[PDB]
Assembly symmetry: C3
Homo-oligomer: 445 residues x 3
């Protein structure tokens, strides 16, 4: 994939092109079980040091089970309810009588198994930890008599190792009110996640996509606590299904565009708004305004469409003609005599104003470019850093082609006397009507 | 508790009612001690593998103590100073000579004990870990001679388990400059927190409230590091006292209300501001503008009044008459031809504009409602999801009654030519004076 | 250092003076190596409990190595690229053939060593964990034959302890796409960080500065994953170099300034903008608008100049004469009949409006000051808390001198009829031109 960039001198904005989409549009739920031991406290006149270590680890196991129980007695509402109704439907199905027995029977001989629940959902279940078998076979002979049997020291170490995953899963589920994201290796080991991906009802390119980007998959997944019932701890892992794949995506970068008069109080400014990620999606454009909601890897963007707005494809014409009548290109006009810079995919936009010292350097050649007052741009070819005032930024050294599209700054087309300055959420046509209305009060006068 | 909701078609806003408050108004401080061992390094010609393991764990203990020491030599200021003066007053009292000896003497025979400090505060102290007794009884005979004694392997495991809590407490206190929130199970185990709640000078309903919502209590608590002095590590846990209980609380949801003309550039919009949580409090209303500052459980809201504004109770009349002269109902008027949705407690508000495809579906019946252009609403009765453009939201399936309050959208009462569009922080009366002022320039002309 | 404060009654703002700077201007990169064992799976008819524990820990080691391998096959782009080009240049140099052999040879006999890479960077390398020596000397004799040798139980415990740091480093590098900040004790122990500081090519006062503020140094550092190659795991720790030291720094606090007419709808307001941290820097002022980007210790501020704007030193004259022609003092004018408070370094600003009950109390004397309507201030001398409505704030009890600079509130100099209210990003001169333009439409009429 070839990454290219285009700087528009007329609007002080840049577009980084050539990116491929992977937008989340669906969910795949899966049940993760941990087999627990329904045991009660036994005291057996025990004092041997190995028995003490075992009972200590057993009390940490009992407190972990009761803590998970108080999590299902009262579950605090979360801000994620608009994205977890699928996993929640699976957890509500699990509360029916006989359904946990159903997954418990299917996982009697194997760790993984497909189970058709009583709500029409054919989920993939697995058993990642078996504490009922371990406690009842290796531990119960110790606390289960008049005097305690002595366990070997290997059992003490193996049980602290096995019980550890229960304690960390209980910690993540406890602090997050039963809904965690991202999904940690405690909730699902990388081996278990990759094995779950291979067994999903998805295409082979989608298994290769999710398997090569497991950390992004984890960051776009949810782990939801279901129930502790009948010696079973069940929780749902909700994994993303990327319904939009390989559609063009581009990132818009914007910076203030002011006039450069030498007398303060006579300058006006404008800045394009709605900078962020754009991806073609189903005849429209999916826009991602928050900056961290889209993870980038090698020219592929992984977004969740729940963090998007749906815009007409004509929004791209703000990049080709900001004065274009098919879409009303949005701007803001607060004045700004302060310098700033934006590091793009293949270069840097610099808005230099006032007395600020703006420059672009190469590590071994020194200063190779000095920006004048106004908005300018430099590619990463031969440039390592950009300095604005007392701040030094690093330019991304990724390969690609930049194109400097020369053009007159549109802020110069505006009469300062009637310019509407201080517009927070405006548009090109909004500014033009405010100019026609301020010009009519002078036309009559 | 019955949750109800009301959608106001006239203002594109909804109010979710029926919630009970629990607002934090006071603090209960408590001292948590860890008994340390004032020991120095001893080298004893040791090479046996068990001795090596013990000295390794002992060096991790010494580095944890010196790290806590450099935390009290220089404590970085935190953004939490406006909420921890109570716990800080207890830590400053502890620095007096003889006060740490006082808590150290009261906890000579028991783990928990009430102590009257020299500043008039009767605090509940406890001793959650005893490393001085363990190191001096089980470890000192090993490093304390010409040649080292051999410890049994159970001691090596028990000491790594005991020293672990010191290392994790030191890690949380080190990365957070001595002030951590929420309070982790390392700072205070769930068993210790519940035991502390039972012993507090609070009513039995307040102990039941805090004990049934321990994770919310932890998230609204602070752990403050006090001192390492004379073989004692002391830190304060500051727990919330919920002075406002069972007062009505409601959540306001707002969405843009535009006109739906078919020609772009001729539409105006308004949006109610100050969406969030409202609770009746002491003759006024406590408003919570940040969304995540109030945790919800089963119809109970748990807020910290430090994240609130105090408003007159007439602010509720924006929900009954936005044109009401007792309170100046605030709005913003930026234009917005972009569609959006808000998931409420019992349904969903949809602002559909332009060509956006807005719908509400049931999982098995399909699309059951198509929104027209404008602001509309649908209850969760029979609805599972809402789709706006390329985005699908899940509707909360909580039981309650919704009421659709029909009314003419107030944006239709405004002449577009003189509407003040692009108002960031405005009000209904603010907009009306700007309309009277723009109408006077035309009245004379 | 003497901390002083100045409240300006005329503009409802305060300046906390007397702070010394430490601004980050450069980076010092360092290579951290972990010697790994290139081993493949061996199965040896083993069933003894100690052998099982060892093979389990060995599988967790192999999955940690393959997980780090999939992190270097595909590295997701991060939002930190503008600040890590130095460490990234070191990681790219490491990918050259023979360069990892170079650091591997220099660290053949010692843990720490200076290495001149093939890109002109003289970095300090160290070897914090040696798993190749441990696995090949203590573990290989177990899995390396027809039947497995039996390890002693001390080896099982020592290997779980040693392998633990690899698993936690792999976890932090996995969830963060190879770039972590702050730098944890797993990436670099406090002992290793202090040893690295002592060996840096910096002055003795800078080593004392960074050694006394290690947690702030960690929070302003980066750990970047380099490569797993030829039995070596290498990653770069990028530590801050504080190029600006002991320059004056001050913190500006602002609060709304309204008129106090008794009839709602007749009041206007203004609020100074650009509250935050200011530090003198290289003939200009470095301004830090985000509040948490500057850590404060004992009168020293530690900022990263990447989170700053560069302003002329005349910006300080907004504190002495807001009407001063050398710098256009910025304000916003949204109306606000809501009360609020700002806790400063030595007191509290209170903006009391409407019916709000504002007061300042001492813990033992009770209410000692009642604020009237308007903007006022109280020092921390004798004051413990400030209550505004239903909210109680704690006043910082730090010693210093406050100065109450009396003056007429400038909002009273404005005619309400022509005031531009609802200005989002304005200035004193911006407001004056809007008043001259609204007065010209009345002058002719
Ligand atoms: C301003 O007036 C000109 C002249 O008739 C017209 O062509 C233009 O469309 C007007 N602008 C707006 C935004 O109405
Ligand atoms: C606008 O003018 C009308 C007509 O006198 C008056 O009743 C109304 O109060 C005015 N609005 C404002 C906000 O002053
Ligand atoms: C407003 O008019 C006065 C009178 O001439 C003038 O002195 C002042 O500079 C003007 N203000 C602005 C911002 O132009």
């Amino acid at each position: 994939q070839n990454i290219t960039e285009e700087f528009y001198q007329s609007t002080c904005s840049a577009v980084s092109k050539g990116y491929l989409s992977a937008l989340r549009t669906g969910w795949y739920t899966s049940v993760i079980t941990i087999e627990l031991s329904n045991i009660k406290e036994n005291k057996c006149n025990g004092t041997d040091a190995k028995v003490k270590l075992i009972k200590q680890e057993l009390d940490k196991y009992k407190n972990a089970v009761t803590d998970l129980q108080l999590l299902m007695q009262s579950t605090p509402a979360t801000g994620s309810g608009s994205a977890i109704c699928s996993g929640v439907a699976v957890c509500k199905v699990l509360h029916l009588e006989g359904e946990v027995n159903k997954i418990k029977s299917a996982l009697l001989s194997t760790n993984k198994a497909v189970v058709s629940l009583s709500n029409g959902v054919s989920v993939l279940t697995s058993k990642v930890l078996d504490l009922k078998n371990y406690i009842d076979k290796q531990l119960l002979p110790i606390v289960n008599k008049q005097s305690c049997s002595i366990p070997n020291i290997e059992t003490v170490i193996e049980f602290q190792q096995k019980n550890n995953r229960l304690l960390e899963i209980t910690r993540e589920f406890s602090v997050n009110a039963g809904v965690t994201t991202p999904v940690s290796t405690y909730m699902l080991t990388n081996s278990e996640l990759l094995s779950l991906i291979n067994d999903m009802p998805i295409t082979n390119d989608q298994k290769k996509l999710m398997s090569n980007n497991v950390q992004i998959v984890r960051q776009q997944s949810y782990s939801i606590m279901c129930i502790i019932k009948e010696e079973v701890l069940a929780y749902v892992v909700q994994l993303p299904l990327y319904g939009v794949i390989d559609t063009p995506c581009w990132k818009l970068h914007t910076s203030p565009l002011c006039t450069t008069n030498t007398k303060e109080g006579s300058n006006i400014c404008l800045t394009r708004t709605d900078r962020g990620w754009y991806c073609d999606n189903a005849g429209s454009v999916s826009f991602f305004p928050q900056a961290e909601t889209c993870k980038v890897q090698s020219n592929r963007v992984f977004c969740d469409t729940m963090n998007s707005l749906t815009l007409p494809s004509e929004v791209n014409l703000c990049n080709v003609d900001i004065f274009n009548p098919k879409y009303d290109c949005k701007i803001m006009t607060s004045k700004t005599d302060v310098s700033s810079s934006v590091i793009t995919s293949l270069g840097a936009i610099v808005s230099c104003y006032g007395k600020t010292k703006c420059t672009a350097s190469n590590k071994n050649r020194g200063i190779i470019k000095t920006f004048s007052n106004g908005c300018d741009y430099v590619s990463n070819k031969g440039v390592d850093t950009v300095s604005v005032g007392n701040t030094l930024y690093c330019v991304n050294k990724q390969e690609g082609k930049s194109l400097y599209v020369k053009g007159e700054p549109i802020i110069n087309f505006y009469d300062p006397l009637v310019f509407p300055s201080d517009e927070f959420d405006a548009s090109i046509s909004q500014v033009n009507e405010k100019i026609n209305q301020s010009l009519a009060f002078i036309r009559k006068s």
